[PDB]
């Protein structure tokens, strides 16, 4: 079942403006507190010519602090798990897509993802590797016919402090019928750190009722 300390192994295959790359890593976190920490390495196609932050949100809503009386679509999906599909529309014209499948093995979660972003402006901040961190955000979660749809306006803070706006839209799909929550929101905090060899991501997510 779910432990207070859960591990994850990560694998991503991606391409950005025609450049292919692979990323692998491991994570640990507390699914009930909605906290997780990840350590990632670029295993193919490094060094990445683009800002890593475009990838960060691709790297699992099981790690969300849900209120006791709200149905938890993601924890209910276990042990079979769930998958999601996402579109990401940047205000400077780039549109990327991503997908992930969340499953379990004997060691913990298996997180397998893909990422495609093939029209980032060549002269823009993503391709100049200017990203630093995403602002805290609030994702609206809307149920319908056994799936959840998420909508969140994102702001990528750049090296100068300029913000780059993006609209993220996600469909979350469990493999079985689960008790469905009402429309609600999830507040996200995502922090990236680097050291020349590895990328660390730390995320905190908390679900709340509207009003």
Tab-separated table of C-alpha atoms in Angstrom:
chain	number	residue	atom	x	y	z
A	1	UNK	CA	0.000	0.000	0.000
A	2	UNK	CA	1.159	3.640	0.403
A	3	UNK	CA	4.004	4.303	2.844
A	4	UNK	CA	4.837	7.584	4.552
A	5	UNK	CA	8.179	7.471	2.688
A	6	UNK	CA	7.814	6.439	-0.972
A	7	UNK	CA	10.545	6.128	-3.592
A	8	UNK	CA	10.221	6.760	-7.333
A	9	UNK	CA	12.417	5.897	-10.302
A	10	UNK	CA	12.196	8.239	-13.292
A	11	UNK	CA	12.782	7.855	-17.020
A	12	UNK	CA	12.035	10.537	-19.630
A	13	UNK	CA	12.521	10.426	-23.403
A	14	UNK	CA	12.251	13.870	-24.967
A	15	UNK	CA	12.996	16.135	-27.870
A	16	UNK	CA	13.173	19.931	-27.922
A	17	UNK	CA	13.467	21.712	-31.288
A	18	UNK	CA	14.646	18.470	-32.878
A	19	UNK	CA	17.297	17.663	-30.250
A	20	UNK	CA	16.751	14.318	-28.511
A	21	UNK	CA	17.611	13.601	-24.892
A	22	UNK	CA	17.083	11.102	-22.079
A	23	UNK	CA	16.805	11.804	-18.349
A	24	UNK	CA	16.820	9.318	-15.471
A	25	UNK	CA	16.671	9.710	-11.721
A	26	UNK	CA	15.252	8.724	-8.352
A	27	UNK	CA	13.040	10.430	-5.811
A	28	UNK	CA	11.663	10.182	-2.306
A	29	UNK	CA	8.649	11.807	-0.737
A	30	UNK	CA	5.671	11.747	1.583
A	31	UNK	CA	2.444	11.264	-0.422
A	32	UNK	CA	0.191	12.220	2.502
A	33	UNK	CA	1.982	15.523	3.083
A	34	UNK	CA	2.258	16.220	-0.652
A	35	UNK	CA	6.064	16.595	-0.485
A	36	UNK	CA	8.670	15.047	-2.753
A	37	UNK	CA	12.334	15.441	-3.688
A	38	UNK	CA	13.974	14.212	-6.912
A	39	UNK	CA	17.544	13.895	-8.182
A	40	UNK	CA	17.817	13.723	-11.983
A	41	UNK	CA	20.642	13.184	-14.492
A	42	UNK	CA	20.786	13.778	-18.243
A	43	UNK	CA	21.909	10.406	-19.601
A	44	UNK	CA	21.649	11.163	-23.350
A	45	UNK	CA	21.824	14.406	-25.311
A	46	UNK	CA	23.556	16.492	-22.644
A	47	UNK	CA	24.306	19.192	-21.996
A	48	UNK	CA	20.759	20.364	-22.650
A	49	UNK	CA	20.728	23.488	-24.872
A	50	UNK	CA	17.412	24.686	-23.373
A	51	UNK	CA	16.145	25.742	-19.947
A	52	UNK	CA	15.528	22.645	-17.820
A	53	UNK	CA	12.439	24.246	-16.260
A	54	UNK	CA	10.296	23.441	-19.300
A	55	UNK	CA	10.652	19.785	-18.236
A	56	UNK	CA	10.285	20.110	-14.461
A	57	UNK	CA	6.472	19.754	-14.105
A	58	UNK	CA	6.565	16.556	-16.178
A	59	UNK	CA	8.573	14.918	-13.384
A	60	UNK	CA	2.773	12.664	-9.930
A	61	UNK	CA	-0.370	13.823	-8.151
A	62	UNK	CA	-0.238	10.897	-5.710
A	63	UNK	CA	2.060	13.341	-3.869
A	64	UNK	CA	-0.714	15.784	-2.990
A	65	UNK	CA	-1.942	16.626	0.526
A	66	UNK	CA	-5.684	16.009	0.230
A	67	UNK	CA	-8.224	16.954	2.905
A	68	UNK	CA	-9.522	13.945	4.814
A	69	UNK	CA	-13.071	14.362	3.490
A	70	UNK	CA	-12.235	14.938	-0.180
A	71	UNK	CA	-12.008	11.959	-2.560
A	72	UNK	CA	-8.404	11.460	-3.676
A	73	UNK	CA	-8.559	10.408	-7.319
A	74	UNK	CA	-4.835	9.662	-7.449
A	75	UNK	CA	-4.393	7.618	-4.268
A	76	UNK	CA	-7.549	5.666	-5.153
A	77	UNK	CA	-6.011	4.740	-8.510
A	78	UNK	CA	-3.399	2.607	-6.749
A	79	UNK	CA	-2.114	-0.016	-7.141
A	80	UNK	CA	-2.901	0.081	-10.882
A	81	UNK	CA	-1.983	3.769	-11.139
A	82	UNK	CA	-2.889	6.408	-13.682
A	83	UNK	CA	-1.554	8.358	-16.652
A	84	UNK	CA	-1.806	11.939	-17.866
A	85	UNK	CA	-1.484	14.033	-21.024
A	86	UNK	CA	-0.574	17.707	-21.011
A	87	UNK	CA	-0.363	20.664	-23.384
A	88	UNK	CA	1.778	23.689	-22.520
A	89	UNK	CA	1.212	26.977	-24.386
A	90	UNK	CA	3.868	29.654	-23.829
A	91	UNK	CA	3.032	33.316	-24.342
A	92	UNK	CA	5.952	33.744	-26.785
A	93	UNK	CA	4.429	31.192	-29.177
A	94	UNK	CA	5.886	27.819	-28.187
A	95	UNK	CA	3.544	24.875	-27.625
A	96	UNK	CA	4.837	21.664	-26.049
A	97	UNK	CA	3.205	18.363	-25.101
A	98	UNK	CA	4.036	15.805	-22.446
A	99	UNK	CA	2.695	12.564	-21.069
A	100	UNK	CA	3.452	10.272	-18.157
A	101	UNK	CA	2.421	6.912	-16.742
A	102	UNK	CA	2.540	6.363	-12.968
A	103	UNK	CA	2.759	2.743	-11.781
A	104	UNK	CA	4.197	0.692	-8.910
A	105	UNK	CA	6.868	-1.949	-8.561
A	106	UNK	CA	8.434	-3.592	-5.501
A	107	UNK	CA	10.728	-0.597	-4.872
A	108	UNK	CA	8.072	2.108	-5.231
A	109	UNK	CA	6.710	4.268	-8.031
A	110	UNK	CA	7.773	3.936	-11.652
A	111	UNK	CA	7.422	7.244	-13.493
A	112	UNK	CA	7.775	7.040	-17.287
A	113	UNK	CA	7.326	10.217	-19.328
A	114	UNK	CA	7.741	11.748	-22.785
A	115	UNK	CA	8.191	15.387	-23.761
A	116	UNK	CA	7.929	17.080	-27.172
A	117	UNK	CA	8.527	20.778	-27.678
A	118	UNK	CA	9.500	21.459	-31.265
A	119	UNK	CA	8.661	25.149	-31.834
A	120	UNK	CA	10.430	27.089	-29.086
A	121	UNK	CA	11.614	30.391	-30.615
A	122	UNK	CA	15.281	30.012	-31.494
A	123	UNK	CA	15.957	33.476	-30.040
A	124	UNK	CA	13.729	33.036	-26.970
A	125	UNK	CA	14.555	32.543	-23.294
A	126	UNK	CA	13.959	28.774	-23.267
A	127	UNK	CA	16.467	28.118	-26.054
A	128	UNK	CA	18.891	30.628	-24.479
A	129	UNK	CA	18.718	28.524	-21.266
A	130	UNK	CA	17.483	31.477	-19.192
A	131	UNK	CA	14.930	29.735	-16.949
A	132	UNK	CA	15.454	29.708	-13.180
A	133	UNK	CA	12.260	28.635	-11.367
A	134	UNK	CA	8.478	28.423	-11.693
A	135	UNK	CA	6.323	30.698	-9.552
A	136	UNK	CA	3.934	29.062	-7.069
A	137	UNK	CA	0.683	28.247	-8.852
A	138	UNK	CA	-2.905	27.145	-8.328
A	139	UNK	CA	-4.270	24.415	-10.608
A	140	UNK	CA	-8.041	24.121	-11.012
A	141	UNK	CA	-9.152	20.465	-11.100
A	142	UNK	CA	-12.517	19.701	-12.749
A	143	UNK	CA	-14.084	16.211	-12.787
A	144	UNK	CA	-15.968	14.705	-15.699
A	145	UNK	CA	-16.978	11.173	-16.774
A	146	UNK	CA	-14.346	9.375	-14.690
A	147	UNK	CA	-11.373	11.663	-15.509
A	148	UNK	CA	-9.932	14.900	-14.129
A	149	UNK	CA	-8.917	17.957	-16.146
A	150	UNK	CA	-6.397	20.429	-14.734
A	151	UNK	CA	-5.923	24.067	-15.776
A	152	UNK	CA	-3.095	26.196	-14.411
A	153	UNK	CA	-1.504	29.485	-15.442
A	154	UNK	CA	2.254	29.228	-14.977
A	155	UNK	CA	5.039	31.811	-14.768
A	156	UNK	CA	8.645	30.836	-15.415
A	157	UNK	CA	11.047	33.210	-13.677
A	158	UNK	CA	14.048	33.949	-15.901
A	159	UNK	CA	17.598	34.963	-14.991
A	160	UNK	CA	16.834	38.663	-15.280
A	161	UNK	CA	13.702	38.231	-13.171
A	162	UNK	CA	11.402	38.545	-16.188
A	163	UNK	CA	8.436	36.156	-16.112
A	164	UNK	CA	7.443	33.930	-19.040
A	165	UNK	CA	3.756	33.009	-18.925
A	166	UNK	CA	2.365	29.626	-19.972
A	167	UNK	CA	-1.018	27.893	-19.865
A	168	UNK	CA	-0.876	24.217	-18.833
A	169	UNK	CA	-3.819	21.923	-19.546
A	170	UNK	CA	-3.761	18.310	-18.307
A	171	UNK	CA	-6.065	15.298	-18.495
A	172	UNK	CA	-5.591	12.760	-15.688
A	173	UNK	CA	-6.939	9.248	-16.283
A	174	UNK	CA	-7.134	6.372	-13.805
A	175	UNK	CA	-7.406	2.793	-15.040
A	176	UNK	CA	-10.522	1.998	-12.974
A	177	UNK	CA	-13.630	3.585	-11.507
A	178	UNK	CA	-12.900	5.626	-8.375
A	179	UNK	CA	-14.923	7.939	-6.162
A	180	UNK	CA	-14.822	11.313	-7.874
A	181	UNK	CA	-13.962	14.556	-6.063
A	182	UNK	CA	-15.751	17.852	-6.684
A	183	UNK	CA	-14.169	20.702	-8.578
A	184	UNK	CA	-11.214	21.837	-6.463
A	185	UNK	CA	-7.749	23.365	-6.633
A	186	UNK	CA	-4.202	22.200	-5.967
A	187	UNK	CA	-1.603	24.737	-4.854
A	188	UNK	CA	1.873	23.954	-6.201
A	189	UNK	CA	5.370	24.969	-5.117
A	190	UNK	CA	8.179	23.627	-7.315
A	191	UNK	CA	11.844	24.464	-6.691
A	192	UNK	CA	14.757	23.464	-8.919
A	193	UNK	CA	18.411	23.359	-7.836
A	194	UNK	CA	21.512	22.540	-9.871
A	195	UNK	CA	25.170	21.755	-9.265
A	196	UNK	CA	26.694	21.128	-12.707
A	197	UNK	CA	26.085	17.360	-12.621
A	198	UNK	CA	22.568	16.792	-11.324
A	199	UNK	CA	19.209	18.525	-11.090
A	200	UNK	CA	17.197	18.490	-7.879
A	201	UNK	CA	13.457	19.140	-7.896
A	202	UNK	CA	11.410	19.670	-4.735
A	203	UNK	CA	7.633	19.928	-4.929
A	204	UNK	CA	4.896	20.641	-2.415
A	205	UNK	CA	1.258	20.262	-3.451
A	206	UNK	CA	-1.869	20.791	-1.332
A	207	UNK	CA	-5.478	20.256	-2.415
A	208	UNK	CA	-8.105	22.719	-1.198
A	209	UNK	CA	-11.816	23.328	-1.595
A	210	UNK	CA	-13.000	26.428	-3.398
A	211	UNK	CA	-14.468	29.226	-1.240
